[PDB]
């Protein structure tokens, strides 16, 4: 086992600056107002967005100014090789919920749907590294499929640091090694970050590198996603007339 | 259970009963006291205090200068408030008590259905209570009974609202206060004291406003050093 061969290659067979082929789709479930699917390698996220609809049991939380974003996270038991139970209610899925919520409340441009729930839901079927970013991106595609206004593709990805270099879009192996991994989600058009999570020890001068690397990886993810979205829109319009 | 007259400047503690001299002369039970038969039960620690009316028939009055933070809706008290919402005709304002008080859209000076007042949620007010009781939610108003707002109504904007202890107010509003007089000499200002420990201030600039709020929230125990320190700072603003 190893992470960076002296030549520059990884285990999976890709250099540091590149990533794995995302293969996506938009329109999985029709009984909803917006759905998506994404596989950013072996990972397999699945998003759903029940649109801006009425609040029931008002319970005096229907914001009158803006809309009410309610995003729920879930990591299936059979996601990891080690089976686990209680995927919801845990102290980690709820943190992921907070994160997704504060991202999309930033992006989703709620000032136009006051007193209304935008219900986002995310289920992770398979996890092999980069488990948050796949979900961010799937929920983005979902939102778009639901014609919900939103400032920009909020594209996310992860970076890491090994042997004085920066890796893009980590997997589980180098994610388990314990090295610093920095996940983020930004809005490309403006160059602004909507989220910045990070967990491990490393020096400071080695920050700009992984930071810009994650940013560029997110730009690439943006390219791929937007090509998908354009194919989808084109096909739909053609079928309309 | 002895000598109400000998402990008029001492520290009384709850439980203590004290009795008063006489056929008799009507008197009044202060806020921190309570009546048990012909005796006065104490309900709050305090430096006891007494007063008598200019006449000789009124008898007297007793109370305890208790310091604390929480407010209780009382009647005939000028109070700052923060509009919390509006339900149809009446809009509910917070006071700092058990429950939120209520106003009426036609209580402000010169208002009717065809002339409604400009009150927006979050707006702050300077009113007084007309029904303050333990059994019913308190209703307040921003107009004297005659029909003129003698300084009441919405406060305004461009000021600082902070909160202090109630005894601090009960002291500052005294006609023999030194701090609030000395402040009238350094730089101008205009301020509202609300008997719920909540104070509003305005001046020309902002540095001055901040220095002023710090003074007020500290003036209970300021040292001459810090006193002249902040005075010099104001002189240099």
């Amino acid at each position: 086992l190893e992470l960076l061969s002296d030549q520059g290659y990884r285990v999976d067979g890709r250099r540091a600056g590149e990533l794995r082929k995302i293969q996506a789709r938009m329109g999985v479930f029709a009984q909803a107002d917006g759905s998506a699917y994404i596989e950013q390698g072996n990972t397999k996220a699945l998003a759903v967005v029940y649109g801006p609809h009425e609040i029931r049991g008002s319970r005096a939380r229907a914001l009158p100014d803006r809309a009410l974003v309610n995003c729920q996270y879930s990591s299936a038991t059979f996601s990891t090789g080690e089976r686990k139970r209680r995927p919801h209610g845990d102290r980690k899925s709820c943190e992921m919920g907070l994160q997704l919520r504060q991202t999309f409340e930033a992006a989703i441009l709620t000032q136009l749907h006051p007193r209304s729930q935008i219900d986002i839901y995310v289920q992770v079927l398979q996890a092999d590294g980069g488990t948050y970013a796949a979900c961010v991106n799937a929920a983005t595609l979902a939102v778009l499929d639901a014609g919900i206004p939103m400032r920009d593709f909020v594209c996310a990805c992860s970076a890491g640091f090994v042997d004085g270099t920066a890796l893009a879009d980590l997997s589980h192996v180098e994610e388990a090694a314990g090295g610093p991994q920095l996940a983020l989600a930004l809005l490309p058009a403006s160059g602004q970050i909507a989220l910045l999570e990070m967990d491990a020890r490393l020096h400071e001068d080695h920050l700009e590198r992984v930071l810009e690397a994650a940013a560029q990886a997110a730009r690439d993810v943006h390219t791929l996603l937007d090509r998908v979205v354009r194919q989808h829109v084109r096909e739909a319009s053609i079928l309309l007339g | 259970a002895r000598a109400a007259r000998t402990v008029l400047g001492q520290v009384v503690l709850p439980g203590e009963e004290l009795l008063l001299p006489e056929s008799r002369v009507r008197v009044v039970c202060g806020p921190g006291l309570r009546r048990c038969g012909d005796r006065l039960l104490v309900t709050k620690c305090g430096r006891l205090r007494h007063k008598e009316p200019g006449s000789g028939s009124g008898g007297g009055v007793y109370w305890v200068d208790s310091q604390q933070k929480r407010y209780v809706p009382v009647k005939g008290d000028h109070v700052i408030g923060i509009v919390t919402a509006k339900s149809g005709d009446i809009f509910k304002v917070d006071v700092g008590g058990s429950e939120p008080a209520s106003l009426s859209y036609l209580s402000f000076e010169g208002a009717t259905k065809r002339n409604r007042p400009n009150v927006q949620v979050g707006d702050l007010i300077y009113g007084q209570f007309v029904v303050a009781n333990k059994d019913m939610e308190p209703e307040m108003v921003c107009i004297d009974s005659c029909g003129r707002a003698n300084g009441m109504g919405v406060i305004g904007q461009d000021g600082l609202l902070f909160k202090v202890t109630l005894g601090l107010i009960r002291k500052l509003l005294a006609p023999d206060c030194e701090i609030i007089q000395e402040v009238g000499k350094l730089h101008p200002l205009e301020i509202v004291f609300g008997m719920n420990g909540r104070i509003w201030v305005k001046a020309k600039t902002i540095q001055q406003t901040l220095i002023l709020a710090n003074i007020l929230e500290a003036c209970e125990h300021m040292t001459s050093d810090q006193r002249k320190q902040i005075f010099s700072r104001l002189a240099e603003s």
């Binding site: 917006g34 778009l144 499929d145 014609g147 206004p149 809005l187 829109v233 739909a236 053609i238 | -």
Partner: protein
Amino acid sequence: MAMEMRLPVARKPLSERLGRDTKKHLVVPGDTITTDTGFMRGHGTYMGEEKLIASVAGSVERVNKLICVKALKTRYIGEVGDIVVGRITEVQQKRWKVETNSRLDSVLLLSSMNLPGGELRRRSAEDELAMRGFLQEGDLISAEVQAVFSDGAVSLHTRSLKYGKLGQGVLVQVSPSLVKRQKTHFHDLPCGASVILGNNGFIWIYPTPEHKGGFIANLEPVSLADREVISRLRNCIISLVTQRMMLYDTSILYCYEASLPHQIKDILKPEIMEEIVMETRQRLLEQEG
């Protein structure tokens, strides 16, 4: 009997069977619409740093000076004359709360609903109590919008007796961006039935009567020869929508006429669906031009 299982086949995208190469201007969020001197914005965009930036995925439309976007999936925004079909959800002391494919809870005020026959005097408490026994929670109403509030909600009414409460019939829920904005949503087809095409995505299908306002429930049976037609229409509509094409009189009539050979059930199997839709589409396109 008959049961059948089958593996899932992979889609065939790009809709190359048509070969159009549209002449439209598609966009996606972050995309920058033409930035010029004072161009007004509409639904489906916003502004940033003196730059008109899209907000939703679809085609852009530039009316004389107004720049708007026409997304491909939304929830019914309220217009002012659009007819509508609605399923009731609540009965408040003053009114009824109705569910359309809208971003809020549509509202039918007690003042709006027509009365039995033409017995119009005024609304009192007795009407406030019949407010329930007549329009039960869960029922359906075929109305038209009255107005749209600033909070987004839609107040709707019942102009005449052609509107009101609905019989037994059947219903479908499609997307609202798949019904051509035109007139006379109320159709009565020669097939032996009638259809209502909401400006929202709620289609209603009821057998057509012979007399020609819902104040009585004709809970009578329905001839097989008038339920088979309704079911075939239902499945034909599902076909049309599953292939993402518009929906109106001629489309449904021609899918009907196409689905006579193929029986009343075997026209949801994606192959039959696709061939019927292709036949219908081709014949519309060639006949109209």
